């Protein structure tokens, strides 16, 4: 059976700063010691390094996964870092500085491009589940869909432009959720105007405009797109059913049922949501200093782990080999992350054939052929 962890961070950090505890046991696995984290500012890099932003300050820390102490490498930026996100494959680390979308490369360590189209701060940054598109949104009520192909191989005198410009909200964005896929995925942007819209990343069209009662501050979706758990600004965790589908494009929550589709038990905002793999336990942070697991099938609480201070980042992962093992020295050291705009790839060969070794019957047949040829 697999193992599921729940990474949690607090905005006060008296003793620890990123506690990793087992889901169905509640016991700690790994802790970390250092500066305070930042909202939407945690991202595991290649399953080896736990990069984290800093609250207010302008730089990014870096913890090796099997090490309780901060490393001596600090990514530095020319302005207050707002959000961070590492690409799923692990090749690119992409962060947002004020209104810029600084993009790095893990292999060489260079700073490829500095994209800049938002008119105000950038407050959410997500990567499509195949690292082909990355969606960025900010406090200017704009959600843009970039493309990792066009923004990388663009001429230095071409000023790359976003593939899609989604401008339907009337208030700052707060969270996004790009599902699996690629050029066929679906985004679930949510703003402060009490709406949660589900877009399409292939053609760029609206599909749903659920309008809630309180401002939405976090949206997560089931991996098969069956439920859309939208957080609230008062504590409730509303739930939309995408497979019932009453059959319109601009719904409203109260006509879409109530009191049987609302998780309740929180007393302040919920700026964190994540659904487990199978889709039976939901982990939600808050601002009332509590991270609690729900029971999506029965809308009941399970445990009420209480942190210190507001909860910034909280998510459910599938525990890699890193956390299970005890030493796991990283394959490659983290390079020197540049802060100025610009061959030489640094990589380990012999990984495109891992396991492509001859089978027992193949070797036996080759040996028998050699014997027969020698006999003649």
């Amino acid at each position: 059976a697999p193992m599921e962890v729940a990474v949690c961070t607090d905005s006060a950090a008296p003793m620890w700063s990123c506690i990793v505890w087992e889901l169905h046991s509640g016991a700690n696995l790994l802790t970390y010691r250092g500066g305070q984290a930042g909202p939407r500012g945690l991202a595991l890099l290649n399953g080896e390094y736990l990069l984290a932003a800093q609250l207010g300050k302008n730089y990014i820390s870096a913890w090796e996964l099997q090490r309780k102490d901060q490393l001596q490498q600090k990514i530095m930026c020319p302005g207050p870092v707002t959000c961070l996100t590492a690409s799923p494959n692990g090749l690119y680390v992409l962060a947002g500085v004020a209104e810029s979308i600084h993009l790095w490369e893990v292999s060489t360590g260079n700073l490829l491009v500095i994209l800049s189209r938002h008119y105000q701060d950038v407050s959410c940054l997500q990567f499509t589940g195949d690292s082909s598109h990355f969606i960025s949104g900010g406090k200017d009520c704009l959600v843009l869909v970039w493309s990792l192909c066009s923004v990388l191989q663009a001429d230095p005198s071409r000023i790359p432009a976003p593939r899609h410009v989604w401008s339907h909200h009337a208030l700052p964005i707060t969270d996004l959720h790009c599902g699996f896929g690629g050029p066929l995925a679906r985004v679930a942007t949510s703003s402060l105007d009490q709406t949660v819209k589900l877009w399409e990343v292939s053609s760029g069209e609206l599909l749903l405009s659920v309008l809630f009662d309180v401002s939405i501050m976090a949206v997560t979706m089931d991996l098969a797109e069956h439920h859309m758990f939208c957080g609230g600004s008062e504590g409730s965790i509303f739930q939309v059913d995408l497979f019932t589908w009453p059959g319109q494009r601009e719904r409203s929550f109260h006509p879409e049922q109530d009191a049987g589709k609302v998780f309740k038990g929180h007393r302040n905002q919920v700026t964190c949501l994540s659904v487990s793999t199978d889709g039976s336990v939901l982990l939600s942070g808050s601002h009332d200093e509590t991270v609690r697991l729900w029971d999506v099938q029965s809308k009941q609480c399970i445990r009420t782990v209480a942190l210190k201070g507001p909860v910034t980042n909280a998510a459910i992962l599938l525990a890699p080999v890193s956390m299970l093992s005890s030493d796991f020295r990283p394959s490659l050291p983290l390079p020197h992350f540049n802060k100025h705009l610009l061959g030489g790839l640094t990589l380990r060969l012999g990984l495109h054939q891992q396991g492509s070794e001859p089978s027992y019957l193949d070797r036996t047949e080759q040996l028998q052929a050699v014997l027969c040829s020698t006999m003649e």
């Binding site: 069209e205 609206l206 599909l207 059959g247 319109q248 494009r249």
Partner: protein, 74 residues
């Protein structure tokens, strides 16, 4: 003089049923070219613009499967 008499007739029924004048036009557009191929030419152009305007005015006036295809084996 005969042609100008008929040319006046065209402006008469153009006003009343402008939609159906454009149905069997075909030949009539050529006929305008035939006579021209100054002042006599001018009077032709007055309702020729009205003639061309007739075609312009006459011709001018997610939650769905979107699975109908326009490919036909023919």
């Amino acid at each position: 003089g005969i042609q100008e008499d008929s040319l006046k007739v065209l402006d008469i029924l153009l006003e009343q049923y402008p939609a159906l004048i454009t149905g069997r036009s075909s030949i009539l557009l050529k006929n305008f070219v035939e006579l021209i191929s100054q002042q006599w030419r001018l009077k032709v152009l007055v309702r020729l613009s009205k003639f061309l305007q007739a075609l312009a005015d006459g011709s001018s006036r997610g939650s769905q499967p979107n699975v109908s295809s326009q490919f036909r084996l023919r």
